[PDB]
Design a protein around this nucleic acid. Structure first.
Lengths: 141, 82, 147, 141, 129
RNA sequence: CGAUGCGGCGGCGUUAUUCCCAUGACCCGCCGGGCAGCUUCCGGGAAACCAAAGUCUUUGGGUUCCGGGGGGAGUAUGGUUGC
RNA sequence: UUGCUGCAGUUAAAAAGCUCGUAGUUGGAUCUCUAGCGUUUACUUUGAAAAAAUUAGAGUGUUCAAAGCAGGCCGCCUGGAUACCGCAGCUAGGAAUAAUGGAAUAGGACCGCGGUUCUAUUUUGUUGGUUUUCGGAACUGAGGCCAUGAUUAAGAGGGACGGCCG
């Protein structure tokens, strides 16, 4: 039962205000705990240096070696694993290059197949991977 | 069902139905006069009474306190008033 | 003295109390001329003010306090200071989201002139705005109405 | 329902419509007043006085015949008790239970029922203090 | 215990009408209920009713015509202005063709159309259609 | 709708206290408050079912505690109670 | 899927093991004006106050439009409107609804009546001394009148008593 009385504005507001914390989205958002834990720290894209290339196996129902890159970020200097998008894009990357990585799409969660990766590489050595894939540019030498 | 005159219920149904749940409230109790066998003086008593009452005329018990209506002593004749 | 509690001498600044009187008036009686003014907004000055012997520079009738601005009311909650009382003001704040109210109170310190004698807790008092008198006192008691 | 019980008992007095004095009543308003006074001197309660007057003397309702209630008649003269009937009775029941409890340390039921009586004293005292029939310094011991 | 006697009265009438009873008994009876029933009768939803008067607090017996769809109370008594009345008659009433909100105003207890006509706000009691 | 437990109310007839009443034990109804049960297209519900879990988009009787996908977890830390 | 409008809590996540209890919220009928008032609010309707820009919106062929505040007629006739502006504070009507109280050991209302103290600053053509009334207060010793003053007793609740019951 909800109190409906004309002088229950404080009771309703107090209840609604404190009961919003049991909402997953509101608590993750408003409490400054997601931000510090987030490797980017509330930034759409982030830049890093490549450690090494790595082959991550897919989930149980369908088997394949997903090509990925271990990258250390520039701002906070912590290690993450980024998934290179299109076919043969791993060839264009080399170890110890400067790489711009973006969120995958699902708001900092995993993908259908590739487990334990949040991020995907968008630029390599200040050149877009789409341009290197479509051959509109060439890796600067 | 569906047609009863809530306004004018039949008097036998009125009396059967609980004293508090009647259309207009009236008590089931009444005031009655007692004629003691060994006395001439008349006394008035409540139908459901709670105290053993005494007739100071001959100094004799009249009615006994009970769970409901007060039981009158043998010989003493009770008659309804109005 | 009766009126004389402090280290310094107490006296109404407008009143002069050292006139040359001849013996026929001196030995006859002794009485200082009591100064009082009428505050404007239809408030009768209480008899105890025009008759009394109390000395108070913060009394609106018999002091240097001009009443101007807002006239409010309040209920007396604490009479535990020297010539000043804590009064409470209750009101309903309207929340438009829910379209309901919430009750709120404000406790303000008001100056109570020593004319208003035998005034008890719980009764309602009409107070007038004046210049600041202490850190927290900005209001002065104008009239009392008994509960 | 009840104050301190789960029962929803519907058992009270059902006073008739006719406020009119019965034709057969011989006693006059003053005669009833004299009777009430004579009864009150013997050290009785308005409850007991009303019961005795209803049973014995055949006065259906004192307030109908006189135009004033028992406590009101005794108050108007000054033969009213210091404590009201109901509070007096709750206090004598409370001290009776306390007198029982002083010997029996194991009787948890008595303790629980005492707490329930104390609550009724305090809730009734607050009302009588609100109507200013008791002094505002009145406490229970 | 019983609070907002109007709520019980309107709920009783509503249940009686849904069940298809030709009369309904309401207890206790107050001015607010009598005026509310008067407004409902004036627009031809209930028809004649009798106030059975005992000394304590009256009872009503209401003749029911098979016209009333719904008769609801609004608790608490919200403060309704002329500008906000469109919103209320948009929310509660089923159509703009028929149905009425009963406001208690300084003029008296009356329907929303008369409230617009006489140009005065008040407190919302209930609705019927 | 028929039972049942406590109290009250009215009424043929069986029985015990020898008999008359008057109390018990039965019997047939009624009234109020409880433990429940059977039936029903009142009406709800995802249904199982529920005379309440009904009177809910025809949505407002009053009020308290309380849930917000599944794990992590009634875990970690802090406070407080206890030998 | 944060539910005031508008959600859930038998089994899907969910009613505290149970009762008492202060704060909090909610609370049964009933009562048709003499320059000061009337018992005070909340509520509702009106009035003045409230920066432009913005937003809504009147007028105007920026070549159309977003815009702009311009422009139009053969020296002239124009425009640069209007509305909204929570709450609270001011102002005047309404009195249904919801709080509050007006007289209960009658120092209660309304009427004329006895005295104590003080004072108004007219008055005996003006001027100095006594005594006054009128104008205006608190205190009282009585009196007449009020149709003199308490609504009902909740299928609300406390308490009393009666015979049981477990």
């Amino acid at each position: 039962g909800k109190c409906r009385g004309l002088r229950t504005a404080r009771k309703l507001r107090s209840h609604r205000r404190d009961q919003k914390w049991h909402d997953k989205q509101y608590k993750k958002a408003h409490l400054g705990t997601a931000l510090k834990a987030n490797p980017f720290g509330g930034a759409s894209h982030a830049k890093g240096i490549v450690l090494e290339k790595v082959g991550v196996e897919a989930k149980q129902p369908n088997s394949a070696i997903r090509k990925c890159v271990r990258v250390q970020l520039i701002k906070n200097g912590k290690k993450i694993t980024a998934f290179v998008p299109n076919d043969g894009c791993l060839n264009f990357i080399e170890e110890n290059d400067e790489v711009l990585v973006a969120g995958f799409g699902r708001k900092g969660h995993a993908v259908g197949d590739i487990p334990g990766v949040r991020f995907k590489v968008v630029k390599v050595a200040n050149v877009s991977l789409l341009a290197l894939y479509k051959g509109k540019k060439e890796r600067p030498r | 069902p569906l047609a009863k005159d809530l306004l004018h219920p039949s008097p036998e149904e009125e009396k059967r139905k609980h004293k508090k749940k009647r259309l207009v409230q009236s008590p089931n109790s009444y005031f009655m006069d007692v004629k003691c066998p060994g006395c001439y003086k008349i006394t008035t008593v409540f139908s459901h009474a709670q105290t053993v009452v005494l007739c100071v005329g001959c100094s004799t018990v009249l009615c006994q306190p009970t769970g409901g209506k007060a039981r009158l002593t043998e010989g003493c004749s009770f008659r309804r008033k109005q | 003295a009766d009126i004389q509690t402090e280290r310094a001498y107490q006296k109404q600044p407008t009143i002069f109390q050292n006139k040359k009187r001849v013996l026929l008036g001196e030995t006859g009686k002794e009485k200082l001329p009591r100064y009082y003014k009428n505050i404007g907004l239809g408030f009768k000055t209480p008899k105890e003010a025009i008759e009394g012997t109390y000395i108070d520079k913060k009394c609106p009738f018999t002091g240097n306090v001009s009443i101007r601005g807002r006239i409010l009311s309040g209920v007396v909650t604490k009479m535990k200071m020297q010539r000043t009382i804590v009064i409470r003001r209750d009101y309903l704040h309207y929340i438009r989201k829910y379209n309901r109210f919430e009750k709120r109170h404000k406790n303000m310190s008001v100056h109570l002139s020593p004319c208003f004698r035998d005034v008890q807790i719980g009764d309602i008092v009409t107070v007038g705005e004046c210049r600041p008198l202490s850190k927290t006192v900005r209001f002065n008691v104008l009239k009392v109405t008994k509960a | 329902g009840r104050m301190h019980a789960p029962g929803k008992g519907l058992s009270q007095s059902a006073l008739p419509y006719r406020r009119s004095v019965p034709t057969w009543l011989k006693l006059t308003s003053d005669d009833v007043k004299e009777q009430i006074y004579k009864l009150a001197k013997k050290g009785l309660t308005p409850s007991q006085i009303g019961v005795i007057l209803r049973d014995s003397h055949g006065v259906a309702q004192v307030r109908f015949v006189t135009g004033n209630k028992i406590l009101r008649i005794l108050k108007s003269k000054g033969l009213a008790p210091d404590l009201p009937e109901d509070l007096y009775h709750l206090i004598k029941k409370a001290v009776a239970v306390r007198k029982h409890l002083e010997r029996n340390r194991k009787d948890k039921d008595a303790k629980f029922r005492l707490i329930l009586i104390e609550s009724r004293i305090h809730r009734l005292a607050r009302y009588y203090k609100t109507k200013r029939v008791l002094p505002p310094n009145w406490k229970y011991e | 215990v019983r609070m907002n006697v109007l709520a019980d009265a309107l709920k009783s009438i509503n249940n009686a009408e849904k069940r298809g009873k030709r009369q309904v008994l309401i207890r206790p009876c107050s001015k607010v209920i009598v005026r509310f029933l008067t407004v409902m009768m004036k627009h031809g939803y209930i028809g004649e009713f009798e106030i059975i008067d005992d000394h304590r607090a009256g009872k009503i017996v209401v003749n029911l015509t098979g016209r009333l769809n719904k008769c609801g109370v609004i608790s608490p008594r919200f403060d309704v202005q002329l500008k906000d009345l469109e919103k209320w008659q948009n929310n509660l009433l089923p159509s703009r063709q028929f149905g009425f909100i009963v406001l208690t105003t300084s003029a008296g207890i009356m329907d929303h159309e008369e409230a617009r006509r006489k140009h005065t706000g008040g407190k919302i009691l209930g609705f019927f259609f």
